[PDB]
Give the backbone structure.
Amino acid sequence: AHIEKQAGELQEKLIAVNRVSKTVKGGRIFSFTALTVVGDGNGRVGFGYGKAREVPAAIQKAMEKARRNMINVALNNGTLQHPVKGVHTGSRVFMQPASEGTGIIAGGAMRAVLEVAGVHNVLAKAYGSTNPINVVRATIDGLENMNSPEMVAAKRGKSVEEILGK
Amino acid sequence: AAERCADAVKEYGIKNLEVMVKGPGPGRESTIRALNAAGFRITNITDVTPIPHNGCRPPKKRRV
Amino acid sequence: SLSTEATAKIVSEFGRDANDTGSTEVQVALLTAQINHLQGHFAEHKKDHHSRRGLLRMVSQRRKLLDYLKRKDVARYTRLIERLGLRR
Amino acid sequence: ARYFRRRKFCRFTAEGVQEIDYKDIATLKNYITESGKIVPSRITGTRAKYQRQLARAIKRARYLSLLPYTDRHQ
Amino acid sequence: MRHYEIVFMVHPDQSEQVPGMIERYTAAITGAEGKIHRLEDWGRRQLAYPINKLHKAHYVLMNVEAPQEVIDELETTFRFNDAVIRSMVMRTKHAVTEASPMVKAKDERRERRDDFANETADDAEAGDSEEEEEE
Amino acid sequence: PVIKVRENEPFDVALRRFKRSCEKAGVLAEVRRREFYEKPTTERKRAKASAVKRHAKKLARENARRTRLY
RNA sequence: CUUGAGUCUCGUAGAGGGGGGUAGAAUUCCAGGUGUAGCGGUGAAAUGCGUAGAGAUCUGGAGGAAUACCGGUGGCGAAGGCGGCCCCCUGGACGAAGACUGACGCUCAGGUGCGAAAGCGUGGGGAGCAAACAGGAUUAGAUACCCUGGUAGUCCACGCCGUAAACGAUGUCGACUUGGAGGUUGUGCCCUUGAGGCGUGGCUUCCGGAGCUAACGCGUUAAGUCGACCGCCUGGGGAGUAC
């Protein structure tokens, strides 16, 4: 959709579901809230928070917001070379380049989100707020500037980007 | 209050009045109107209200 | 603030003979001369603390400019310090 | 043509009259009502210096009975 | 030296006191190598509020330069003069000793704003018609 | 503070507005209260603050027009 | 060396500090003159005060703090801090021309120096206001709430440990980052013609980009990018006490 990556069949990564009410003015609210991530195995920014009266409509709204006005991210499947010191709203992450030979430990659903993110190997334990909504921001702000070179010319690589600005 | 004093002084044989005003309280004009209803010309409404050069501290009133 | 006619005698007598105000010796001698003027106010006015703050600026800075000359030439220094009667 | 420099009604729309002088009676009376008293600085759009110095000069002048200090002195 | 613009005003009936006092004050100034750069008497004027009684005073502008040590003693002097009702002395900053801001207001006074009476005749011998001993 | 200066042709009602210039404010305004020395510098001097809401109100008349609600 | 910083005389803006001098006006008071019954207080009220003549008012004297407005989004001080008006003594800050030295720098544990306010020892001084102390009133009671009397204080001078909500609730001082415009000032240039424009410093404030924040918010005077060096915090109650 629009600028979205070369995605193929849907990612249906449901991360969370909740239900919220004031109940102040006419009995409770019945509507539900959903948080969903839609990627492609090669690295995406797709993250969508949406809501509707019952769960099936809540997820399908949330999944649209997971997929529209999302830029391509160019990592090579499971290797990434140039992360970011990831911060989102006090939930802070700090990945650095690393072998995939070493494995991944990560708790809850999270080793599963990270393996579809392509970022499992560079990953290191979260700090700051450990709230379900913001703990997963590893693949968004932590990739916001990146490269993943396969080229023998890795040591000319920043040179190559200047002479295009010339 | 003005119509009460203004009645009593006919016996002193006063026949004309002029007025001096001294304060911010109510009766700004209404006090004047009652001397003028006593049958006097009240052409000179001379505010002489003393503005001290910032005088003596007024009472605190309530303790909050 | 110091008198026009003292400032010109001080310049005549201190630093080199160029009658400049900038070198380290003439700058101690000018600072001293205001410090002394201000001590004239502090013959009275013993509760005038907000101006004493000012004294310690001029004093501290002279302390610094004395360290600087003594890090440099010792002839100028041993002369100057004895020549304004500073310290004991 | 150049260097005419402060003829009239230029730099400022309202002329600054005095700073700190009070020996002329007329310069103070430039900002003084018929009640015998200063007009506030918000209303006239006077520049703060000429006003700040006039605050001393006007009090000085009033104390020398060049002005009424008080409504009782009208 | 530094310039101090002293203005003082005098009770009409007491003006007769001042022609002996003023010439000692001028000798005390010049005795300190200061100067009288104008000495303008303005004539009688109406006070807004009385000071030591009467709504009228006679205003005298000395226009001194005197050293800083001396003016603190002269200022105390002019305020505690009884013939003087009140006095004010202004700063060295932004001062004229030429070209008087009251030159017109002075003349207007002698022409037009006195009483023209016996009680203001008393002022005029202490006024511009000034008499003083020679230094 | 009816003010001494007489309104042209004498009448029973004093024209209090056209006379007054700077009377009551600060001196006879903080009535039956404890008089402070430095407090007025922050308590009373609120002229700039009160001017902003009046600039905002006069802006929004034109903005109801630009949104087209009027 | 100047690219950091320092200094000479000159101008400029301001409530920075210490000690002197000075005026009128209401409460308050006294005296005489005039004159009769409430005055005061409040939500409504009563205590107080008063016929020895109150309250207010005319004339004149008395006395002590204070000095409103001008006072403004102003300006100043080291932070809190500074406001009657003047002088003596003097700081610190803002510009500008001639001229000099040339890292003499930065920060700062310990350190000396310094109080918003009241507390405070004696002398001076007291008009009003006021904790206490009395008495009124409030009410399921009422020390809180609300009223009347009324003292130390407040006011000066010197003296005693500098407390705090001691402010940017924002460390010090320095470098850099699209800006416009308000308030207002040094000074070059303007039919100076619109508290105006432009050149260049000055403090001061609204508005918002890059960036940063949980959020408000900050934004060229940062809460940004940073710089060196320092102070300080590490769950609550119990404790700013114990030692």
